[model samples]
Target: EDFPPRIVEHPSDLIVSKGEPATLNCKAEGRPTPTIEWYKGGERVETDKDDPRSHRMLLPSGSLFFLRIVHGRKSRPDEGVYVCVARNYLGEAVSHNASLEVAILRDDFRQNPSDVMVAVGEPAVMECQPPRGHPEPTISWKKDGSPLDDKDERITIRGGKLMITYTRKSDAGKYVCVGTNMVGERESEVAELTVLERPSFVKRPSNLAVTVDDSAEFKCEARGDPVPTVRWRKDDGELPKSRYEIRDDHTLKIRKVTAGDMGSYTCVAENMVGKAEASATLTVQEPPHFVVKPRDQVVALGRTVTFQCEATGNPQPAIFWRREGSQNLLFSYQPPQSSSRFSVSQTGDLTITNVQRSDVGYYICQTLNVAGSIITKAYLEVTD
Candidate 1:
């Protein structure tokens, strides 16, 4: 007696690498031996039984064996939803649906990390794009030809990006991005990381006091990763033309210090990372000197006579006049006594009004400052 056929061992979903051998199994039970066949998407499958040279073969045990999974553009014969069928004339039985997919991993990466540069204690980031794959390739990183250890508190990896916060000197190196899947793993091009430091002062310039005609010197030094360069600038003015020299060691020298050079001097140290500045004060000291001197003069009685004197110096010198061999001292800021006949001008000049015989005498012009003092003398004669 013949009975209907029933499927037992049904095919399971499979994900196989392209061009690799695979199998889809099926089993059947019936009163009469049932013949095996395979169908994909409701269409009968062509196997070696139909054509001896076909890559898909029908096994004696009702399993489908693929010499090689044929998958490509315009045709994917082995990749589809499939069902195994058993037939024996009494009736036909079908197995559960199963899908066959070809696992693929491309060789090209979508994105590659680029070289990054950051200062010490700064954050650094590297990104990567994994190659396309059936299972979606996972991302990892390597540094200096070794696996990167993300266990450090400063290091982190997420979403194909590697980040290091508060980067240190040791963080600089060559890095590689790795894309992996069941098929195999591929490495992206290497990217280099550079960590640098900002400029900091080692030896700073200091304030100096130099006299006129004396050379002023300031020394400045700085330390940094790549070494910093030092330059000099003056506040409120330009450096003395052709008279200043900057040494290789970053020392600044002024050949002749003058009143115009007596201000703040700044030292600038800089590099690609950052810049720093330091300041030094320059003080120039000078002695009082007379630019104009009182000259001898003759005046008729009852006529007015005048004498001129001028002086210059740092700290501003004070000027006064006195009659030679006389006890009286005349100042330019106030009225003169003893005869009302003599007066001193603010410009260190002596003027005599209503000139009389008493006004005839040698006059002394004197000026003084913190540096030193100076004096000049001239004679005045009264005529009838």
Candidate 2:
């Protein structure tokens, strides 16, 4: 008994590059051996059986084979929806419909990235559009002929766009956009990336303490792309027009510094990208000098006598009282260590209570400081 033919394996769709060999397989079963034939869009297909010179071959296993798939604008005979038919004594069977396509990759890109410019610590963005092609092309990027590394957290590639955050000087280079598909890969024109840096301090000024009528210098240095410009400024006041000079190397020099020159000085560095500044304090110190000197004192017996001495200086002067003939020293602001009848006031004054004839002598007042010291003498007379 003979049975109708049934398809066992249906032809499958195929996508191949132009000029490449391709195959669409088909298989059928029947009680009696079946004869296989191929069709395109419901029309019979001619193979080597019909024309010995034809590029299409109908293999013994019922598959359609092409020595090389041909595709062109004038003639495209191999690409279309297809089916395989098998027939036996009882009936015929048809395999499922299958489509054949030719892969394509164009040479021109839809969009190409242009040169990008950014500053250090700023973000940079570049965009590209891949060429039109079959199996829609995928995008990738290369830097200096090497593939870009995604391991860096600052770099990102998404949707045919390359983004870099917190850009650095190392990130500047030539970039290429690659569009790839089954046909092959195509590279776009090179795009340059430039990075600029802001001014940064290399050496900062230091604080200084100098005496009046002396000279002082402060040095500042900075580094950046394009070479930053440096300047000097005095905080809260103007530098003396005739006494200060700013040198070519950014050194601030003050000749014959005066009391008015004691304050904060600042160094400023600037560029097109950014600016930075530093500050240093200038202090002026002076030697001690007496504002008031102790004078001669006369007192009656048993009466109290006092001597006045006041002094001033950059660092408030320390005052002392001593007798010309004795080796003992007296501090001007405390009680006598050996007797309760003598005392000194905070204003550098010496007081003697219950004056007696023995309390008559030459007393000296001395003021001292880090800069220098001074001394003055006055006689104390006690009358009986």
Report lDDT (Cα) of residue 137, candidate 1: 92
Candidate 2 lDDT over residue span 1-384, tens digit each: 777898988777778998878887788888777888777777777788789987677787778788777678898877787878889888878778887888889999999989987788789898999999998999999999999967899998989899997888899999999999888999999999989888888999999988889999999999988699998999977878989898888899999999999999999999887899999999888898888888898899999988888999986888888889786778855657766677778888888899889888998988888778999999989987
Error of 1 at 322 (Å): 26
Q: Judge candidate 2 at residue 95 and give its lDDT.
A: 79
lDDT of 1 at 19: 76
Give each model a TM-score: 0.69, 0.73
Candidate RMSDs in Å, in order, are 7.7, 4.7
* Per-residue lDDT over 1-384 for candidate 1, one digit per residue giving the tens place of the 0 to 100 score: 887999888778878898778888788978777888777777877778789876667888887788777778888767777777788868878789887888999988999999998999999999999888988999999999899877998899989899998899999999999999878889998999999999999999998877788899999999887688788999878999989999988999999787888999999989999999999999897888889888899989999988899999876789998888888889878777776677787778888889888777899999997678999999999999
